[PDB]
């Protein structure tokens, strides 16, 4: 009852005459809704991981993934991936959300230098072949392909750049084969003193140890941004619910509130809106291009007017800032008071 809440707040068994601000009331949600795009085509993850032969590290392959559904249960079909490292997101079933664009980069390197595909690393790979941004957001998948790429006599299918004047900026590809001059005398396109060819071959051999077996690496880059999402997780939508305190998930935007009609003059390119406090106030329905308002469910403060407990046990309750027509009357266990 209100009196016992006063005692529990004051941490005392007797209460003096006065008014005490005990807690705040608020309406609990009733149901939950989810709204996602209705597309059904899947993303071409098959070709990226099932390619017959991968590209070189100094010239890596780049792929655009868009306008599809990215289900990550497919990746548990081939041999176990011995390395699954993600940055900015957890891979354990938290990858079922909406992204804006996806870049897929694939190459082949050695095992000992696999730890070089990471932010803030140094080495031949990091600054001469493939560099990652400091604020990287994505996942790197490394597995062993020693049975396929490596050969007894060594294959020259894969090469890496050893000499370069300056470090590579992140996501920059260099395919130049010009001689690396480092002395006064000209190189004239041939090697010699301070004249070098930047390209060197791995020459993988199965007889090599653990640190030299070839490894295939696929680097996935996402971009969580306010722009409309093309690729999304495999989730089921739900009918639109309005004028009820409900949960909602509009393309990954989770929240609790009330959705109603809006008079916002949304220009065709504008997706959602914001208020002065830089928080979401309006949203666009992904399936019908409808503009909906977000309003938090009813809330307020409660005070209890008590005479001294030595006098009486009756109390009065003051709902602060309520017009008395919206004072919460619902009983079916949906109030946080």
């Amino acid at each position: 009852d209100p009196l016992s809440e006063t005692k529990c707040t004051l941490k005392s068994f007797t209460v003096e005459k006065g008014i005490y601000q005990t807690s705040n009331f608020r309406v609990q949600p009733t149901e939950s809704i989810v709204r996602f795009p209705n597309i059904t085509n899947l993303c071409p993850f098959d070709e990226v991981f099932n390619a017959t032969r991968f590209a070189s590290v100094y010239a890596w392959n780049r792929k655009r993934i868009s306008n599809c559904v990215a289900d990550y249960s497919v990746l548990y079909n081939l041999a176990p991936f011995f390395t699954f490292k993600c940055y900015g997101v957890s891979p354990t079933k938290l990858n079922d959300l909406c992204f804006t664009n996806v870049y897929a980069d694939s190459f082949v390197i050695r095992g000992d230098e696999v730890r070089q595909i990471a932010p803030g690393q140094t080495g031949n790979i990091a600054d001469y072949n493939y560099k990652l941004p400091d604020d990287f957001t994505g996942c790197v998948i490394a597995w062993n392909s020693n049975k396929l790429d490596s050969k007894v006599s060594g294959n020259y299918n894969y090469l890496y750049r050893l000499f370069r004047k300056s470090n590579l900026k992140p996501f920059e590809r260099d395919i130049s084969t010009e001689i690396y001059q480092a002395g006064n005398k000209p190189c004239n396109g041939v090697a010699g003193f301070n004249c070098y060819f930047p390209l060197r071959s791995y020459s993988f051999r199965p007889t090599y140890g653990v640190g030299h077996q070839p490894y295939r690496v696929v680097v996935l880059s996402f971009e969580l941004l306010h722009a409309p999402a093309t690729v999304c997780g495999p989730k089921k939508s739900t009918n639109l619910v309005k004028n009820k305190c409900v949960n909602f998930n509009f393309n990954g935007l989770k929240g609790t509130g009330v959705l109603t009609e809006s008079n916002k003059k949304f220009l065709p390119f504008q997706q959602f809106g914001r208020d002065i406090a830089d928080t979401t106030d309006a949203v666009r329905d992904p399936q019908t291009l409808e503009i909906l308002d977000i309003t938090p469910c009813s809330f307020g403060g409660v005070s209890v007017i008590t005479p001294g407990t030595n006098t009486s046990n009756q109390v009065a309750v003051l709902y602060q800032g309520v017009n008395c027509t919206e004072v919460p009357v619902a009983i079916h266990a949906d109030q946080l008071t």
Partner: peptide, 28 residues
């Protein structure tokens, strides 16, 4: 007259304002 939405935006973050006990009529 000489001495004198943003309020609704603040209320939704948990910032509210209590009215004074003595109204302007009582103070006059």
């Amino acid at each position: 007259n000489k001495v004198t939405d943003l309020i609704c935006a603040q209320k939704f973050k948990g910032l509210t304002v209590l009215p004074p006990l003595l109204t302007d009529e009582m103070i006059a």
